[model samples]
Target: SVIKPDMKIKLRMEGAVNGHPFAIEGVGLGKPFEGKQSMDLKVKEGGPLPFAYDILTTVFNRVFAKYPENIVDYFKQSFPEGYSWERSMNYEDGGICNATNDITLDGDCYIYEIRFDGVNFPANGPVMQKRTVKWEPSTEKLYVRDGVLKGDVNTALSLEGGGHYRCDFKTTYKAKKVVQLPDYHFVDHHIEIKSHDKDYSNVNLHEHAEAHS
Candidate 1:
């Protein structure tokens, strides 16, 4: 198959991990468990699982087909940066609810907020949200992962549809060692999330996991 434009890969999900915890917490109240269920996700199509297999399939395959080179590049391009992808995510008001760092080529980082109207996440639309992260001199230098292609995650949370039906809590994980991409200029240093429970502790789309976006 040439990979149809609409061809979706399907999101296979493992249960929640020890670090993120899988449970129905916040707004819905009661259990303080972490992790996500399909019903929790307000995306509708997400279909009761935070990691919707169908939608995920579309996203994963798109990244591979779109950026045959660095999977990370395709991954970052898919979402509206500085908004959905932020440094901190909160469960209450949705999103980090506080601070989110934007990673761009020009090297501008800032704190910002991201919100979606209704429940639909625009398909392949220009990034409507905007925020610039501030750079720190010495110690903060580590925070800068500069490049036309880079991804970062730190204590984050995501709420579906500006509501807290389905939300994802996150812990960032950078590569423990150096990684070499096919192109000499391309390199991978860290990963998105690290789960203490699931077997996907090392889910690298191009290398390990099933090209998950």
Candidate 2:
């Protein structure tokens, strides 16, 4: 055992949710057992918020059943939204869909308005996301869960009036302490999110414009 210090860790989270790139600045917690820190994540601004929804619902009209019904449909349904710190920030209308870390929802993604707590971002400038959520530190057992960084900050969305979803998020988080790798210690801060996504051109704006109406 490395007897890793419970040094308060700062986490900058960023990953691909439905192939869209997103990032969160930094969250402070610790490894080894320093307990939970208030996770005040506000969909942190920038990135294709709506398209992630597009991929989630297979279209904005989430009620519409997607094509080629197969395992892929159910597989697509498996992922949760991005703003949630834990509880699959899901949305459903017939009941709308539905997080933890002692979490709660506090953001917006209505057709009328799109915003988060920081009061940044907009719509038609082109729209936004779900759940500006929080998590209270319980016995969350905040340590490495099986394998990988900051224990899979497993996120999702909550559209309040929009939609919500989660993903396996096979990605790495940046840890400034209680780290697993001795090799990337000093350069830890720079390794925030190794998102190799250079394919921004894929999100077709003309089709997105159609999605608005």
TM-score of each: 0.20, 0.24
Runs in model 1 deviating more than 4 A are 15-88, 92-145, 148-213
lDDT of 1 by residue, 23-106 (tens): 211111111011111111112222233332111210111122223333333333332231123222222223222222221211
* lDDT of candidate 2 at residue 89, scale 0 to 100: 27
For each of the candidates, give the backbone clash count.
Answer: 25, 23
lDDT, model 1, position 57: 13
Best by TM-score: 2
Against the reference, the lDDT scores of all candidates come to: 0.22, 0.24
Q: What is the lDDT of residue 47 in candidate 2?
A: 49
